[PDB]
Amino acid sequence: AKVVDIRIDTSAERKPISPYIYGSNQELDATVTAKRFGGNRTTGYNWENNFSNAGSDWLHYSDTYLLEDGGVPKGEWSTPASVVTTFHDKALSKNVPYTLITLQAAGYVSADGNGPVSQEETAPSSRWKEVKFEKGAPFSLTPDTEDDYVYMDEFVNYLVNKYGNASTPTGIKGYSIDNQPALWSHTHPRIHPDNVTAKELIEKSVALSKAVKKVDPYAEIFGPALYGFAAYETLQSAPDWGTEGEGYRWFIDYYLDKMKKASDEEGKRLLDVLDVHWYPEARGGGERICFGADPRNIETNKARLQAPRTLWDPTYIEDSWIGQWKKDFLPILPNLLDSIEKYYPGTKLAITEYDYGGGNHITGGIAQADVLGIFGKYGVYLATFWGDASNNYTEAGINLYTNYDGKGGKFGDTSVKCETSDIEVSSAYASIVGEDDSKLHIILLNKNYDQPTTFNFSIDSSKNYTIGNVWAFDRGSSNITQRTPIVNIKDNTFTYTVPALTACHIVLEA
Ligand SMILES: OC[C@H]1O[C@@H](O[C@H]2[C@H](O)[C@@H](O)[C@H](O[C@H]3[C@H](O)[C@@H](O)[C@H](O[C@H]4[C@H](O)[C@@H](O)[C@H](O[C@H]5[C@H](O)[C@@H](O)[C@H](O[C@H]6[C@H](O)[C@@H](O)[C@H](O[C@H]7[C@H](O)[C@@H](O)[C@H](O[C@H]8[C@H](O)[C@@H](O)[C@H](O)O[C@@H]8CO)O[C@@H]7CO)O[C@@H]6CO)O[C@@H]5CO)O[C@@H]4CO)O[C@@H]3CO)O[C@@H]2CO)[C@H](O)[C@@H](O)[C@@H]1O
Ligand SMILES: [Ca+2]
Ligand SMILES: [Cl-]
Ligand SMILES: [Zn+2]
């Protein structure tokens, strides 16, 4: 019999949970609170004609994938930024509060959709148009597809026009400075063959932020969208990190420091959100927990259930080069947040890309649930998952927070102290709505693989809870079903045993 005590103090550690941590990049069979238009294809995207390059993902084709994959109407395929408007209309039509858009920064964008771009056609060539941030002239809601340029600030304008600015309801709140620059020369060699440098990146960002913050002072700028650890530390061995990184624990500090400095010189904040991508290197059972990992492998599934700990748990060492050789930077969330504090306070933090694998397995769903619990508890501002609708259990973890009863029910927005006696076998997050603890929401995850877990809840609230309804999903179905309610609460205390590998959302009320 595995017994664990859960302790909650509805009046301690009260912190708001950003509503934007529950987002996605792809369209999911779930309720998400933010949609991001980013990733490899977005780097060479041309708003004037909607053409883009698959880069190395696929023979360097310039084509209409984004119009196809986006579900755009062939009528609009020629309409400027149709791809992005279609993207935002769909978003708005689902009452999704936040739309992040990626702006082109690598330097060039598809001039056509004629297909393959020969190495000989490496930019600049007739296959591309040169991207420029500021137009230095009057914008036109009818861009000139014939010139040799594409203006980013004019791009925002076309948008801020159609939807109003970032302060308006229907407006687009965020803009990202491209996608994974440290990998530009790997993913888009036909656009930026040389390895981006620390100076170049900082320089282009500042340029782009200003260009944009003059078309919409209220818009939020995300950056740099680093693909993974290597870019966090040295911008993937940037050619000038040796000189630039002088006296910097890692590139993250450097970026935050220079963006800050630049912001002081400009007289206004240029960096709104530090944006990084996080794909667990956490290994188990021979393979990595994500990127095509086999759910038959019980050892990897078990490694996945513990992987989330790397985000906050200072006592957890995952099996990976990062756990093995990067302990000075783990847990990663505290370190990233810790860095924001030293070189640019007030700066938000977003994990615009992440996937813990097992998307169609119970553990994929518990990990996702646990990850979402961590983002809210540590102040993450926005998070958009990467993966499609086949990930039924991942979609399950998200709904546990955004729509657990199928009718719009959701986790509270104010996190409260909530401790577990055994973090290895379980996880628990608790919240209330605003400053009112009349209803205490609790996410309770039983990581015990094949044996049940009994939980002893002792809550310290101003209210007396007499009932506790339950919703949950498990190895039985990725569908969240209501369960028998808790009714024997004595002085805000009860015992609830939960089946193996189960994720539930409890809701207590007086
Ligand atoms: O096909 C359908 C349509 O597709 C369309 O295009 C799609 C794509 O299909 C879709 O995938 C894409 O979605 C993308 C998204 O757009 C991207 O944002 C991103 O994709 C990225 C990944 O994020 C990225 O990870 C991946 O490659 C990574 C890889 O994942 C990493 O694992 C790897 O990391 C390396 C690391 O660099 C290396 O250094 C490390 O080993 C070192 C370690 O770094 C070092 O520190 C350590 O040092 C120790 C040392 O070991 C020790 O001895 C000594 O004593 O101490 C020192 C420390 O002091 O040593 C170790 C070695 O021991 O190893 C790791 C790997 O294990 O890096 C690579 C990159 O290089 O790349 C992709 C992009 O290519 O996410 C999504 C994909 O997941 O969306 C597209 C559309 O937008 C087409 O357009 C259509 O046409 C198609 O139809
Ligand atoms: Ca043009
Ligand atoms: Cl990067
Ligand atoms: Zn699905």
CATH dotted code for 18-405: 3.20.20.80
- Which residues, 6 or more positions from 361, have their beta carbon under 8 angstroms from its beta carbon? 295, 301, 393
The pair of structure tokens assigned to 482 is: 């209501």
Q: What are phi and psi of 326, to 5 degrees?
A: -120, 20
CA distance 238 to 258: 16
Sign of CA dihedral 109, 111, 113, 117: negative
Q: How many Cβ atoms sit within 10 Å of the Cβ of residue 462?
A: 11
The tokens of 182 are what?
A: 């440290």
Pocket test for ligand 1, best of 43, 53, 57, 226 (most atoms within 8 A of CB): 57
Q: Are 262 and 338 in contact (CB under 8 A)?
A: no
Rounded to whole angstroms, the Cα distance separating 228 from 223 reads: 13
Q: How far apart are CA 168 and CA 158, in angstroms?
A: 15
Residue 223 has phi, psi (to 5 degrees) of: -170, 155
Residues 6+ apart with CB under 8 A from 490: none
What is the Cα–Cα distance from 192 to 124, expressed in whole angstroms?
A: 10
Instruction: Yes or no: say if 208 and 152 are a contact pair by the CB < 8 Å rule.
Output: yes
Question: Rounded distance, CA 285 to CA 136, Å?
Answer: 57
User: Using an 8 Å Cβ cutoff, are 282 and 272 in contact?
Assistant: no
Which one of the ligands is nearest to 188 CA? 1
CB 443 within 8 A of CB 453: no
Cβ pair 356, 371 in contact under 8 A: yes
Instruction: Establish whether the linkage from the previous residue to 452 is cis, with ω within 30° of 0.
Output: no
Nearest CA to ligand 1 atom 56: 325
| Atom 21 of ligand 1, nearest CA residue | 227
Using CA atoms, how far residue 491 sits from 6, 205, 457, in Å, is 15, 55, 11
Technique of determination = X-ray
Q: How many angstroms from the chain centroid is the CA of residue 311? A: 14
d(CA 108, CA 4): 56
Q: Which residue has the tokens 């990725």?
A: 478
Amino acid at 43: T
Ligand 3 center from residue 425 Cα (angstroms): 34
Q: Is 57 annotated as a binding residue?
A: no
| C-alpha 496: how far from chain center | 33
Which ligand has the minimum distance to the alpha carbon of residue 385? 1
Q: Which residues contact 411 (CB under 8 A, 6 or more apart)?
A: 17, 376, 400, 401, 402, 404, 429, 431, 441, 443, 505
> Which residue do the tokens 């400095």 mark?
261
State whether the Cα torsion 83-87-88-90 is positive or negative. Answer: positive
DSSP 3-state of 415: strand
- How far is residue 92's CA from residue 100's CA, in Å, rounded to a whole number? 12
Question: Could you report how far apart the first and last alpha carbons of the chain are, in Å?
Answer: 31
Residues 6 or more apart in contact with residue 258 via CB below 8 angstroms: 202
CA dihedral 107, 111, 116, 122 (to 10 degrees): -40
Residue with the two structure tokens 């809870």: 465
Task: Find, among 97, 83, 81, the residue nearest to 384 by Cα.
Answer: 97
CB 311 within 8 Å of CB 332: yes
What H or E segment, with its residue span, contains residue 177? Answer: strand 174-177
In sequence order, which ranges of 214-266 are alpha helices (DSSP H)? 229-234, 241-244, 251-266
Does this chain's domain 1-17+406-510 share its CATH topology with 18-405? no
- CB proximity list for 450: less than 8 A, separation 6 or greater: 500, 501
Annotated binding residue at 68?
Answer: no
Of 41, 155, 47, 36, residue with least CA distance to 96 = 36
* CA separation for the pair 396, 103 (Å, rounded): 31
DSSP letter for each residue of 347-403: -EEEEEEE--S-TTSHHHHHHHHHHHHHHHHTT--EEEE---TT-HHHHHHHHHHH-
Question: How do beta strands 502-509 and 467-474 pair?
Answer: antiparallel
* Nearest CA owner, ligand 1 atom 17: 39
The token pair at 98 is: 């936040």
* C-alpha of residue 186 to centroid of ligand 3, in Å: 10
Closest residue by CA, ligand 1 atom 62:
321
CA-proximal residue: ligand 1, atom 64 (nearest): 321
3-state secondary structure of 228: coil
CA distance 227 to 371: 18
Give the CA dihedral 335, 340, 345, 349, nearest 10 degrees: -100
Of 302, 296, 334, give the one whose Cα is nearest residue 319: 302
Q: Which three-class secondary structure state does DSSP give residue 28?
A: coil
CA–centroid distance, residue 10 to ligand 1 (Å): 41
Output the CA 133–ligand 4 centroid distance in Å: 38
| Residues at CB less than 6 angstroms from ligand 1 | 39-41, 54, 57-58, 65, 179-180, 183, 186-187, 227-228, 230, 277, 279, 321, 325, 353, 386
Is omega for the bond preceding 331 within 30 degrees of 0, making it cis? yes
Measured from the Cα of 54, ligand 1's closest atom is 85
Q: Give the containing element (helix H, strand E) for 199.
A: helix 198-213
CA distance 87 to 36: 9
- 32, 104, 36, 83: which is closest to 353 by C-alpha? 36
394 CA distance to ligand 4 middle (Å): 8
Cα gap 444→459, rounded to integer Å: 14
The rounded distance, in Å, linking the Cα atoms of 405 and 441 is 13
168: closest CA among 176, 180, 160, 179?
160
Q: Are 458 and 440 in contact (CB under 8 A)?
A: no
DSSP secondary structure string, 288-354? ESSSS--TT-HHHHHHHHHGGGGGT-TT---BSHHHHH-GGG-SHHHHHHHHHHHHSTT-EEEEEEE
Neighbouring C-beta atoms of residue 249, cutoff 10 Å: 14
Pairing assessment for the beta strands 382-385 and 348-354 based on DSSP bridges: parallel
Which ligand is in closest contact with the Cα of 180? Answer: 3
Cβ contacts of 68 within 8 Å, gap of 6 or more: none
Tokens 């490694």 locate to: 303
- Mark residue 306 as left, alpha or beta (left: phi above 0; alpha: psi -120 to 50; beta: remaining): alpha
Which atom of ligand 1 is found nearest the CA of 233?
A: 46
What span, in angstroms and rounded, lies between the C-alpha atoms of 153 and 133? 6
Question: What's the sign of the alpha-carbon dihedral 295, 298, 299, 304?
Answer: positive
Domain boundaries, given as residue ranges, for the chain = 1-17+406-510, 18-405
Nearest-CA residue for atom 22 of ligand 1: 227
Ligand 1 atom nearest to CA at 52: 85
Measured CA to CA, the distance from residue 374 to residue 376 in angstroms comes to 5
Quote the distance between the C-alpha of residue 332 and its chain's center. Answer: 15
Tokens of 326: 């990067």
Sequence-separated (6 or more) residues with CB below 8 Å from residue 295: 301, 358, 360, 361, 363, 364
What count of other Cβ atoms lies within 10 Å of the Cβ of residue 1? Answer: 7
Ligand 1 atom closest to Cα of residue 55: 85
* Topology (CATH) of 1-17+406-510: Immunoglobulin-like (2.60.40)
Which residue has a Cα nearest atom 42 of ligand 1?
321
Ligand index nearest the alpha carbon of residue 255: 3
476-484: which pairs have CB atoms within 8 A and are 24 or more residues apart? 478/360, 478/365, 478/392, 478/393, 478/395, 478/396, 479/396, 480/396, 480/399, 480/400, 480/404, 480/405, 480/406, 480/505, 482/405
Q: Is the sign of the CA dihedral 32, 378, 417, 427 positive or negative?
A: positive
Instruction: Say whether 395 counts as a known binding-site residue.
Output: yes
